[PDB]
């Protein structure tokens, strides 16, 4: 299912890559998902 939780990619987001793990880049707020934006 990959990040299922009945919630797909967060709206108004833009994942990227730090300097693995990856994240949806929560620029809209002020942090970064390090495991799941909503699980």
């Amino acid at each position: 299912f990959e990040i299922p939780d009945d919630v797909p990619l967060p709206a108004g987001w833009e994942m990227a890559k730090t300097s693995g793990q990856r994240y949806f880049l929560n620029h809209i707020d002020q942090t970064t998902t390090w495991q799941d934006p909503r699980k």
Binding site: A16, T18, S19, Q21, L25, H27, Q30, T32, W34
Partner: peptide
Amino acid sequence: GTPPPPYTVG
């Protein structure tokens, strides 16, 4: 180690 992503608190 595992550093966080860029764009931190202003």
